Amino acid sequence: YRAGWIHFTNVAPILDSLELPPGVTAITGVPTQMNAALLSGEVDIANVSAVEFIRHADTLAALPDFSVAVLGPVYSVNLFHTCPLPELRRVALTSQSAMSVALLEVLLRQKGLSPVLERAEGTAESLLAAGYDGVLRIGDDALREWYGVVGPLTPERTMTSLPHTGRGITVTDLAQEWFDLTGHPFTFAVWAYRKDNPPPAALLQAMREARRRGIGHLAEVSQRHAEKLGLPERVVQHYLWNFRYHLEAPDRLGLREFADLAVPGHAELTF
Amino acid sequence: YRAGWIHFTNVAPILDSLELPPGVTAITGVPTQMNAALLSGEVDIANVSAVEFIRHADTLAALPDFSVAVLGPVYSVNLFHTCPLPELRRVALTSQSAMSVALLEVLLRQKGLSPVLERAEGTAESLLAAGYDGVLRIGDDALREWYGVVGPLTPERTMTSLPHTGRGITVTDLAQEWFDLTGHPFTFAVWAYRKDNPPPAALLQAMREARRRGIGHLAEVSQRHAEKLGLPERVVQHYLWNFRYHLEAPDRLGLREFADLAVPGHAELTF
Numbered sequence: 057y058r059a060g061w062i063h064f065t066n067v068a069p070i071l072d073s074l075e076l077p078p079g080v081t082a083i084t085g086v087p088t089q090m091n092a093a094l095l096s097g098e099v100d101i102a103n104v105s106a107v108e109f110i111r112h113a114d115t116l117a118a119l120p121d122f123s124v125a126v127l128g129p130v131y132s133v134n135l136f137h138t139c140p141l142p143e144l145r146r147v148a149l150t151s152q153s154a155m156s157v158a159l160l161e162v163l164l165r166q167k168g169l170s171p172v173l174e175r176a177e178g179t180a181e182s183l184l185a186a187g188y189d190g191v192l193r194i195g196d197d198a199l200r201e202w203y204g205v206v207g208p209l210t211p212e213r214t215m216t217s218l219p220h221t222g223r224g225i226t227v228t229d230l231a232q233e234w235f236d237l238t239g240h241p242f243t244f245a246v247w248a249y250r251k252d253n254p255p256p257a258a259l260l261q262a263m264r265e266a267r268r269r270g271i272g273h274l275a276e277v278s279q280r281h282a283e284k285l286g287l288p289e290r291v292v293q294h295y296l297w298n299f300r301y302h303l304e305a306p307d308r309l310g311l312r313e314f315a316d317l318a319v320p321g322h323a324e325l326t327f
Numbered sequence: 328y329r330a331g332w333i334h335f336t337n338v339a340p341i342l343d344s345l346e347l348p349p350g351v352t353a354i355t356g357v358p359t360q361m362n363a364a365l366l367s368g369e370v371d372i373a374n375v376s377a378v379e380f381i382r383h384a385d386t387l388a389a390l391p392d393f394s395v396a397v398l399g400p401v402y403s404v405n406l407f408h409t410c411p412l413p414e415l416r417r418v419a420l421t422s423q424s425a426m427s428v429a430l431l432e433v434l435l436r437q438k439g440l441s442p443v444l445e446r447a448e449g450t451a452e453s454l455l456a457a458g459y460d461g462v463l464r465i466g467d468d469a470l471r472e473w474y475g476v477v478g479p480l481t482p483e484r485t486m487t488s489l490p491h492t493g494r495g496i497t498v499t500d501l502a503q504e505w506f507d508l509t510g511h512p513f514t515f516a517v518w519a520y521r522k523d524n525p526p527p528a529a530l531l532q533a534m535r536e537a538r539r540r541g542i543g544h545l546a547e548v549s550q551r552h553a554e555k556l557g558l559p560e561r562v563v564q565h566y567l568w569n570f571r572y573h574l575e576a577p578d579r580l581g582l583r584e585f586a587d588l589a590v591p592g593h594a595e596l597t598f
């Protein structure tokens with residue numbers, strides 16, 4: 057049984073101490089490749105974007121109790137802009153940000169907005185000075201670049217009290233926008249496998265034990281990844297504490313609302 | 328400046344490592360004693376139930392960045408029953424809790440139910456085996472008796488996957504019922520102070536540092552309280568992980584909705 061992992065910081069509580077059982081191997085790679093690897097059969101299980109799970113819910117099931125979800129701001133799914141949203145004419149989409157385009161478009165439609173979207177490469181600040189009013193960033197780079205815009209953090213100030221603007225750049229958090237729109241959590245990723253190929257029970261148990269270790273030792277998890285990202289430990293710690301990892305009823309509700317808005321007529325979501 | 332704390336398990340990550348700055352003292356006691364001390368001015372800040380804050384929002388404000396809230400099940404606010412809710416003619420109450428009764432009454436009115444609430448003595452299981460078919464339990468007892476009913480954990484089963492029924496007893500979670508009703512978090516407690524008399528910055532800073540230590544070391548916090556409660560470390564750990572401690576916009580929305588239903592005409596909630 058083969059597993060494809062994506063090594064975003066927000067799954068470190070699950071993956072940093074994971075010990076594969078006998079008879080399971082794992083590869084790592086970009087979200088692009090894991091999606092491809094799961095459909096073709098290169099891997100049997102992978103943590104894939106929500107929209108990828110939804111669009112292939114005919115073929116794929118998800119683990120019942122694993123998610124990357126959040127209620128409120130997520131800090132790593134970010135629209136950086138220099139003008140108000142109704143004025144946006146051109147939004148750049150960076151490398152991995154194509155899985156959150158569907159959420160961006162849902163939010164833009166509800167406001168009646170339709171800027172042109174273009175694939176680009178670079179950081180938010182450099183793309184904002186290379187012909188774009190808006191830049192969509194996800195993952196570790198989004199978190200670091202959010203902090204670059206609105207930080208630094210001082211001892212008296214706290215991560216949640218930081219402004220959303222800095223140096224003429226506003227950082228719009230799409231998970232907060234989703235909360236403003238629906239009142240509900242947003243589910244960004246699940247653990248998906250072909251319906252006729254369930255994962256071995258030893259894999260699920262090792263995954264649950266690693267998540268329990270990571271949740272139990274969040275300062276240790278956070279310190280390792282803050283060093284790699286160049287951020288304060290407390291930034292990463294609050295970042296990880298915000299996530300919802302157990303795909304519970306509120307997470308499934310937001311997943312289903314997203315599915316209906318972004319992939320109407322999707323096959324039924326099964327776990 | 329005087330603090331009055333109630334050391335419920337769910338505030339352990341905030342209060343267990345708290346180091347009071349110079350010129351701040353703390354006492355402890357039961358909620359009703361602490362509420363009165365706050366309102367009469369013999370303490371200056373206290374963690375009080377949501378109802379207590381809502382009913383005295385004329386003269387109290389709440390810290391903007393501290394809460395006890397949850398989205399979905401809370402596990403320590405439980406209605407145990409052997410028959411469907413519409414067939415309950417009575418519901419036993421063991422403790423005094425204005426908070427959980429006001430929540431229970433909100434849920435029951437929304438469904439057009441009206442069982443009689445009666446004070447009684449015992450555990451959920453002795454009262455059900457006696458003259459009742461419905462029992463409300465809160466706190467440590469509610470958490471321990473939920474586990475007695477639906478447990479125990481195994482290497483394969485986790486807390487999230489446990490059934491909500493056991494031995495013919497259904498455990499209805501009032502926070503999950505609140506989510507089913509509203510889609511939103513429920514805020515059980517805030518840190519309240521008289522509007523004249525906001526806390527000194529050093530206390531807030533100390534509380535923020537204590538919370539970061541507790542959140543960053545959940546296994547350590549959980550093992551202490553798990554041993555005191557006779558529960559697996561894994562139960563307390565997930566229990567504590569499940570809370571929302573920062574009084575963010577979804578938490579305030581849940582709080583205001585509860586304010587509107589349970590305390591009609593309440594003064595405006597201020598932070």
Ligand SMILES: O=C(O)c1cccc(O)c1
Pocket residue numbers: 062064066067087103104105106124155156244245
């Ligand atoms: O945020 C994640 O962990 C994640 C994982 C897979 C796909 C994706 O869009 C996001």
Ligand SMILES: O=C(O)c1cccc(O)c1
Pocket residue numbers: 333335337338358374375376377395426515516
């Ligand atoms: O759940 C709590 O921490 C709490 C704190 C104060 C009053 C109350 O009813 C509940």
